[PDB]
Design a protein around this ligand. Sequence first.
Ligand code: MET
Length: 245
Amino acid sequence: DDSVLKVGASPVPHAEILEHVKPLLEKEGVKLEVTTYTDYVLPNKALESGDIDANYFQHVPFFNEAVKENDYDFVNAGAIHLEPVGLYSKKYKSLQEIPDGSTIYVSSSVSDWPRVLTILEDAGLITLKEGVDRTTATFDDIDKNTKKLKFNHESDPAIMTTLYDNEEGAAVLINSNFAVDQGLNPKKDAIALEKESSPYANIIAVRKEDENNENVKKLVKVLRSKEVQDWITKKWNGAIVPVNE
Ligand code: MET
């Protein structure tokens, strides 16, 4: 019942998922402990410093950028779930209603930029240039822009819900962890939603020396088990999508 495993997480759904599985981990001889973080920097700082043994908040493209930028010696212990990202607006209820020259507000996190670009492409409002590296797409890669949309990417991910609430810009990209915590339902409230979120699975990350840690593996397996995945699916009504790999 008792090897300690300290995991840092976003409040919702991550920390709520972790709390939910504590009794299951206790049966596997692990005492799961959760530290909640409101941003996307401190959970990685905390993992490097040892304040936590693992984190659960980021997807692989974000992880790779963070590793490159900060020389973090971390590893990906496994994907757990997807959060199809939405564009939100109180004023405009469809992308097609957005006036020409409107500004779309997205966070400063460059690894989420391709996601707003794929949403606008799926909607038929933009195309990306021929021979663009789609893996690292930025606003400079836009070719067709039917509504001549402008993009503001200055704000932190944690303040995107504020921009939405204050009605800044025609629409706002909000990561689902933040949107759900503020009472938004991505599958009902978003004016446009990301369709293929597979590359943006949220992972368990650990320091490289703990790559083979058995307790981390127990956690990953419990988090992917059928009974936990069903609970996740029921709790947030499909906005949080469990993955098996
Ligand atoms: C820190 S990378 C973004 C994580 C967020 N929960 C998402 O899947 O969009």
